[PDB]
Write an enzyme that holds these catalytic residues in place. Sequence first.
Site, mmCIF file in Angstrom:
data_model
loop_
_atom_site.group_PDB
_atom_site.id
_atom_site.type_symbol
_atom_site.label_atom_id
_atom_site.label_comp_id
_atom_site.label_asym_id
_atom_site.label_seq_id
_atom_site.Cartn_x
_atom_site.Cartn_y
_atom_site.Cartn_z
ATOM 1 N N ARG A 126 15.347 -8.481 -9.574
ATOM 2 C CA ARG A 126 14.573 -8.723 -8.382
ATOM 3 C C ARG A 126 13.874 -10.074 -8.473
ATOM 4 O O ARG A 126 13.329 -10.433 -9.518
ATOM 5 C CB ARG A 126 13.474 -7.650 -8.286
ATOM 6 C CG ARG A 126 12.366 -7.815 -9.369
ATOM 7 C CD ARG A 126 11.137 -7.101 -8.988
ATOM 8 N NE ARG A 126 9.852 -7.542 -9.560
ATOM 9 C CZ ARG A 126 9.602 -8.609 -10.329
ATOM 10 N NH1 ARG A 126 10.542 -9.460 -10.706
ATOM 11 N NH2 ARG A 126 8.354 -8.825 -10.729
ATOM 12 N N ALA A 175 -18.067 -0.844 -11.728
ATOM 13 C CA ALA A 175 -17.617 0.279 -12.539
ATOM 14 C C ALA A 175 -18.278 0.279 -13.914
ATOM 15 O O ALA A 175 -18.645 1.329 -14.432
ATOM 16 C CB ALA A 175 -16.117 0.190 -12.716
ATOM 17 N N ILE A 178 -21.294 1.898 -14.059
ATOM 18 C CA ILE A 178 -21.159 3.314 -13.837
ATOM 19 C C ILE A 178 -20.705 3.980 -15.104
ATOM 20 O O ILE A 178 -19.647 3.677 -15.653
ATOM 21 C CB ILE A 178 -20.079 3.724 -12.829
ATOM 22 C CG1 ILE A 178 -20.612 3.575 -11.422
ATOM 23 C CG2 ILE A 178 -19.789 5.223 -12.996
ATOM 24 C CD1 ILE A 178 -21.080 2.175 -11.130
ATOM 25 N N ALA A 181 -17.159 5.520 -15.408
ATOM 26 C CA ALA A 181 -16.301 4.728 -14.548
ATOM 27 C C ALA A 181 -15.482 3.766 -15.399
ATOM 28 O O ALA A 181 -16.002 3.193 -16.352
ATOM 29 C CB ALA A 181 -17.168 3.889 -13.579
ATOM 30 N N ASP A 290 4.710 -1.134 -10.722
ATOM 31 C CA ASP A 290 3.846 -0.487 -9.738
ATOM 32 C C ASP A 290 4.039 1.006 -9.794
ATOM 33 O O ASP A 290 3.077 1.759 -9.675
ATOM 34 C CB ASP A 290 4.046 -1.017 -8.322
ATOM 35 C CG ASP A 290 4.163 -2.551 -8.266
ATOM 36 O OD1 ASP A 290 3.542 -3.254 -9.111
ATOM 37 O OD2 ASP A 290 4.914 -3.039 -7.369
HETATM 38 N N1 LIG Z 1 1.390 -12.633 -4.719
HETATM 39 C C1 LIG Z 1 1.494 -11.296 -4.641
HETATM 40 N N2 LIG Z 1 0.372 -10.536 -4.574
HETATM 41 C C2 LIG Z 1 0.492 -9.223 -4.429
HETATM 42 N N3 LIG Z 1 1.593 -8.472 -4.406
HETATM 43 C C3 LIG Z 1 2.666 -9.229 -4.586
HETATM 44 C C4 LIG Z 1 2.702 -10.599 -4.773
HETATM 45 N N4 LIG Z 1 4.034 -11.074 -4.688
HETATM 46 C C5 LIG Z 1 4.727 -9.954 -4.768
HETATM 47 N N5 LIG Z 1 3.995 -8.845 -4.514
HETATM 48 C C6 LIG Z 1 4.439 -7.472 -4.385
HETATM 49 O O1 LIG Z 1 4.921 -7.077 -5.627
HETATM 50 C C7 LIG Z 1 5.671 -5.872 -5.387
HETATM 51 C C8 LIG Z 1 6.590 -5.576 -6.557
HETATM 52 O O2 LIG Z 1 5.837 -5.186 -7.697
HETATM 53 C C9 LIG Z 1 6.352 -6.053 -4.031
HETATM 54 O O3 LIG Z 1 6.165 -4.869 -3.261
HETATM 55 C C10 LIG Z 1 5.623 -7.261 -3.418
HETATM 56 O O4 LIG Z 1 5.147 -6.969 -2.122
#
Ligand SMILES: Nc1ncnc2c1ncn2[C@@H]1O[C@H](CO)[C@@H](O)[C@H]1O
Length: 330
Positions: A126, A175, A178, A181, A290
């Site tokens: 990607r 946090a 806290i 937290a 993520d």
């Molecule tokens: N500069 C950025 N800040 C925040 N999210 C980002 C950035 N560039 C890529 N993404 C997000 O990272 C995700 C992949 O981890 C994608 O869903 C994309 O939208």
Amino acid sequence: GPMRVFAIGNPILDLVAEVPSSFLDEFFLKRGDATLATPEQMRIYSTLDQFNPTSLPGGSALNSVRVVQKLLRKPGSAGYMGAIGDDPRGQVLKELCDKEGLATRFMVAPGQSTGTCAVLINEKERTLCTHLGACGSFRIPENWTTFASGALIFYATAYTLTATPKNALEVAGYAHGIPNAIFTLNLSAPFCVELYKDAMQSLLLHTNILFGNEEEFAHLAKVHNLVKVALSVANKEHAVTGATKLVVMTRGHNPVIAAEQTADGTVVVHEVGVPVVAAEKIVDTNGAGDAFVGGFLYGLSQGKTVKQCIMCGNACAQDVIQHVGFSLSF
Ligand SMILES: Nc1ncnc2c1ncn2[C@@H]1O[C@H](CO)[C@@H](O)[C@H]1O
Ligand SMILES: Nc1ncnc2c1ncn2[C@@H]1O[C@H](CO)[C@@H](O)[C@H]1O
Ligand SMILES: [Cl-]
């Protein structure tokens, strides 16, 4: 309490598409890389249509809190703040979140277009090309702590430093006051680590859990001092009662390395094995991290152990890489 996780981030719109390498070179992009679109790269957003792109909510943290909400079920189980534009795009993005039951309070940057990301898929890799737009106007509102009242887990990605280090700094500093937290942060990308040095340093001291991958941790190590396991143990000094001090380093298919410092300066490290996933079954790796952080935070709020937290993430990431980009139903 209702709100379990609270995060700030850059709400952006994702434009996915499988493109030929010839495309990567024309738009001066490096396969696997993540960066902010240059003026000569602004053309990609249009030229992409000739590739039947797909479209959906993006933004690193957004995806993470999203995974959280889905697993937590209850509305507002996960709260989120960020800035969208005053355009149709931002409306769509906002509608999506609400449909999910996510608690959000989006700030609108008048006259600005919601952020957009060109997710380039080539091979299985990607390539991320972004144009933050409104995102750079993010400012944390006077009553944020009231909105996220009761959350014990605060998350922020390094990507947020582009707007201002203040946001994370602010959230981080709350946090920490806290008791119970915890503050968590993600390295987001090599460039973050590379450009937000000084700010990164101050925030780290307030981080209870640091996430990242080999690539980012490597850049991290070099920039600072320290320069796998060593890099991981290295980073723990930057953060370094006993309030949680953990560092999770993901390594693609290799075992996840987690190092934590206990109340008595005792260092415990864990190398968690990643379950094998045949190459062919792998679609793409977009949104892998993520999905990983999401699983983690979920389990975390659940009181499971680190190892156990690392396992939930692995699962999430696994489900996702077996689907075209980020997917939501597990
Ligand atoms: N500069 C950025 N800040 C925040 N999210 C980002 C950035 N560039 C890529 N993404 C997000 O990272 C995700 C992949 O981890 C994608 O869903 C994309 O939208
Ligand atoms: N090649 C791969 N094989 C198996 N899992 C992978 C691979 N690349 C990434 N992952 C999964 O995604 C997570 C984040 O990269 C890893 O912790 C792992 O769970
Ligand atoms: Cl659901």
